[PDB]
Symmetry: D2
Subunit: 343 residues, 4 copies
């Protein structure tokens, strides 16, 4: 079995060759058909702070993957051999406050596939049976591979009051913010504004946004004010950029909602009273995918065709050419990159 | 000025010549550009049980309309002369338990234009200033004229948990149901099924619904089982047909939501324990339009093009030819019929 | 081991003597310390329609019970030997629409302890480990035994908009409606009205209600109107009595919520339009306990002392004297009856 | 008439003799029976940064008061002469995006009695008719006078998911925090912890909180760990102290809610990713009182006795002795100080 792994406390990844793992009680063996990469894999790649204080080599990485169920552990009745399944990366403890409360997306003992244990950057991987989401056989594995990150967008968009019949400002047109714009557009939001200084990705939202904006070339606040008449009702933050955050909040009309998925790199300067309290803003910190509700909403949009994730898949490279795949990541020249573990 | 009114407790309406109403404090004078007809108007027209117990001749009917603010009463700050407006038919008291709660759509003292007082089937109509929703000057009056019934659809769809990423079944492809079909399609529901025995009407849903069903030709329940694998998460009831209701409630999965706008003509046989309680269903009684929240969502969808009502405007006729107009609606071989009070 | 079981398709129960069951994978063995009875056990007792079309003798009954964890199945890490636990009677499939959706209280393949499989009317019983709710050692088993039905009240009360700062009308002062009145009173509802023609139980709510009402001796509608000024905001239905249902709905102000737990014996005559739709009422069909959310809210009220369930425990009889316990049930002369399986 | 006003941009206030204001269209004349003082009034009194940028002398201050409707302007249907009323300090415009949404508490054009125009620190005050909340004639004016700040507590507590059956931590035992403590206790929260270094104040919470904590004496976080076994489900922030905020946000369990009313004096250092996003926390910015929804809930609790504010009224003094009154509040050795404008 071909697999991509982090073998030591250092930069880069190593294409190794492991024995096909066997599933046990409550587990299944997935024969990966497609996998994708995101900023998290990049952190590991670069072997930065985050990675250093979290990754325990040796580890086969990859948390965005899809495939077929090859065999199941003893006593596993679901899913079944032959099922096409996408994977939920978070493995929840089912024994902490968050889990009783039903907030599995924030289980205090979360274990992320490809971050804490072997992931999908391999021809085969073993995962908990409860983490497999069965997909119709006709859903392409390449789209199926990005359902996990798509779920991050879905969760952010549908959190709080949703976006149907509401004015939306999405700050950040990265892969996720991009899926968000696809979702909000299909959810009936309007007007829909998407802001991102990078024109490459910003152009990707043109067919979904009502107004594209380069905060560097144009004054976002003024554009929003010209498009809505005042502010937006919902703010979907996917940039993690302090300047964008403060800007987004100002664009919000009093009493509106700010749904934040973006992870800033450093603590921000925040005027609680001015940006949140006095304006009656509600800030929703979005993490992971609401376990199952997010997957239902998301896959429903995808299965029925309300959204088409195909245009976000810019490159598909054999797993063996991972080096280039990660270079595209750092580059930013691609949206989502699919890795074929079979080559 | 030309006007259409019920001049005595009996069938039909009479084209009459009334003087132009005068707007006083807190009122405005609206020059009607377009008006539409609905089931209610048919009730009044036929003079059935419903009408007999609610209408008090002499009454100028018409509650679905739009026009220009030709004049405003002393002290009326908004809207303004020249403004293009759609009208909220319900006039609330601001002095009842419902109003104090914000549930203006169920004001204990609700008064309805074209029902309790003179409506829009005339060249001019005086309404409360606060009932005029100013539209963009470029919105076609015909569409503006049907924002009221559109709101009934909007209210129903966005009530409760909404429909984004949810399987939806719509019983009733009448005008309001079709509008609901447009809205849910534009809101990201899926799969989307619409049921109605009138083929002429069921057809207008073809571009919005994922599955059309003639309950007389097919077993709606079994069709839903195939389309969703079990039931729908949301049932939007717009028929008022007892059989449809029980059927619709059966197509609901346990824990689902039933949003009901439909007005059944007679009490129904209801197995409370079997159709609601034991299945954890929640039934939402939908009445009117949430004041402003519904208009915001609905006009947002319309203004931005998320939805396009134009295909619902099947007929146009001068007010002088109302007889023909009501006959059409009566036949059910029409969706939204527009009356022009100027001719 | 002493156990009470239904051994044949007939009335009554038989005190038998079985071998102590052994827990297996994912199971635990509970040494019951206290058990209680409700209308469901009564149905079985009487061997009526419900029971006949649901009970498969031989069966050890009882679903309201508490006790200590004696031993656990192999591989069970929670709960632990020594833990005091109350039991959730519903065993969910974790493989049906309702479960993905998180509505376990309505799992389509629910299996009720003491209704579909051996229950707690025995010194020992084996149940799924996930169904045990650990309680502090100092919570009396007698109170712990009724947490299950208390959860039915909690679920009804906190469904929808809750009751804090709201006027409440509870129709039905049976054991459950009684716990409800205790809950709403502790949740800050007010004014609080409790209606029940049976003065025995109606008096039990005196220390919790603001107004007790005998619908037979007094006109409920008038009392509500005198206490609130119009109607109540919330209706908690626990009687299943058609007359009470129609009455309760009328007492509701337009736009209010009706939370229904009560199971009517026959289909009711329901005027959808008049009692629900036109008044903008939302009817919440409450079933079971929201899996875990209900238990959290409920046990929180109980552990912190916000509510004291002690006064609802009117009788405690040895299990061997079940005959009398069931007679009290039918009698209605008691609230909750505790059965001591150790005698 | 006697009045207390800021007559120039500097410290202190001046007892002056102003003529009796006259109520015009849509207004009423209120004869003040009692008024209270709050932090805002202290700001104005000290003439600090906050005041300097908001106050425009000459200003009669006082926004927390109650009295009798002595007169009404032409056409004022409600309230009526003789009515006992409490006043909503915020005067909304009914013509901004916040108002159209119903979020009147954050009206873009909010005007505040005793801040932007003459308030209640006088024998008479003219206010908008719609700002008068009629109370039962038997409610003590002193209590009626503090329903405004009480509403800030109510709004905070019932925002989001409320507090029933939930563990709650309250940071800030200032007047509003104590009121929140009363409310949560009466709403069924538990365990309930309140934190504040001022022992004089922390003490008033003793009868409502389950655990009192002096963050200077004990480690609040570790105390919460012992009381709940982990964290609280809800954090009600009423201090505005940065340290308290971070601490409070840490005591929150993942997926919890932080409702913030507290106004920090300076921007804070906020690790958005660590304190909000990654932990799935939702921060609710609380401003003012939801118009009518908050007053309903709050007066409901008060009218029915679910809560009793009397113990919060620590001092009473004629308006002529405001100096003494402000000094007390300034020392923090007082909770709600009542000023009597008649003396
Ligand atoms: N909360 C969670 O569980 C979770 C999960 C996965 C990813 N994330 C985070 O969510 C964010 C979005 O993910 P992504 O893959 O799209 O990231 P990305 O870094 O690829 O995209 C961020 C985008 O922000 C844009 N941006 C920068 N400054 C901006 C500004 N001032 N205004 C508007 N846009 C601006 C950039 O052009 C960039 O395309 C990242 O910060 C990521 O780390 C969070
Ligand atoms: N609650 C409110 O405030 C409010 C406001 C306006 C209208 N309404 C009511 O809402 C409903 C919708 O309005 P509309 O103008 O679209 O009504 P409509 O009468 O034009 O349409 C009702 C449709 O139900 C269809 N139908 C009949 N039996 C059916 C069945 N067995 N299964 C599926 N469909 C079936 C009919 O063919 C018809 O097209 C009406 O009942 C109306 O009275 C309520
Ligand atoms: N939905 C569920 O999952 C679920 C679970 C358990 C029990 N239940 C049902 O909930 C209901 C309440 O349970 P319970 O144990 O308190 O039942 P119960 O039968 O002991 O009490 C019902 C009460 O209704 C009262 N009542 C009858 N007519 C009335 C009227 N006209 N007005 C006011 N009160 C009236 C009676 O005096 C009686 O005390 C029952 O119908 C029970 O079968 C439902
Ligand atoms: N958002 C709004 O519309 C609105 C309206 C009114 C008041 N407020 C604000 O709400 C807050 C509460 O009002 P108040 O009158 O009760 O305020 P207050 O100033 O009387 O009380 C604040 C309390 O915080 C306590 N405190 C200080 N450090 C603490 C710490 N480290 N941990 C715990 N407690 C600590 C203080 O001892 C003090 O008693 C204030 O900040 C006020 O400015 C906001
Ligand atoms: Zn990823
Ligand atoms: Zn967990
Ligand atoms: Zn109509
Ligand atoms: Zn009203
Ligand atoms: Zn029971
Ligand atoms: Zn299930
Ligand atoms: Zn104040
Ligand atoms: Zn405003």
């Amino acid at each position: 079995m071909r697999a991509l792994a982090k073998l030591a406390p250092e930069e880069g990844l190593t294409l190794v060759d492991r024995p096909v793992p066997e599933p046990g009680p409550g587990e299944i063996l997935v024969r990966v058909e497609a996998a994708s990469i995101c900023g998290t894999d990049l952190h590991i790649w670069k072997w930065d702070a985050w990675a250093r204080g979290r990754i325990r080599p040796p580890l086969v990485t990859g948390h965005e993957f899809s495939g077929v169920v090859e065999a199941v552990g003893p006593g596993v009745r679901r899913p079944q051999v032959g099922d096409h399944v996408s994977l939920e990366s978070h493995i929840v403890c089912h024994a902490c406050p968050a889990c009783r409360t039903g907030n599995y997306h924030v289980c205090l003992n979360t274990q992320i596939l490809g971050v804490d244990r072997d992931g999908g950057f391999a021809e085969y991987v073993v995962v908990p049976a409860e983490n497999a989401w069965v997909n119709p056989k006709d859903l392409p594995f390449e789209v199926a591979a990005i359902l996990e990150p798509f779920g991050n967008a879905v969760h952010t968009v549908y959190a709080g009051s949703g976006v149907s019949g509401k004015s939306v400002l999405i700050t950040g047109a990265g892969p996720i913010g991009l899926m968000a714009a696809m979702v909000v557009r299909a959810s009936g939001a309007g007007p829909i504004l998407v802001s991102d200084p990078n024109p490459y990705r910003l152009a990707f939202a043109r067919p979904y946004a009502d107004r594209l904006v380069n905060p560097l070339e144009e004054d976002l606040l003024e554009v929003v004010r010209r498009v809505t008449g005042s502010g937006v009702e919902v703010l979907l933050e996917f940039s993690g950029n302090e300047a964008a955050i403060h800007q987004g909040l100002m664009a919000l009309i009093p009493g509106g909602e700010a749904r934040i998925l973006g992870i800033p790199s450093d603590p921000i300067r925040f005027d609680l009273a001015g940006e949140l309290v006095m304006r009656g803003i509600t800030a929703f910190g979005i993490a992971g995918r609401r376990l199952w509700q997010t997957w239902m909403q998301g896959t429903a949009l995808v299965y029925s065709g309300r959204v088409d994730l195909s245009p976000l898949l810019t490159h598909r490279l054999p797993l063996s050419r991972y080096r280039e795949a990660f270079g595209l990541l750092a580059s930013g020249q691609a949206v989502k990159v699919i890795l074929d573990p079979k080559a």
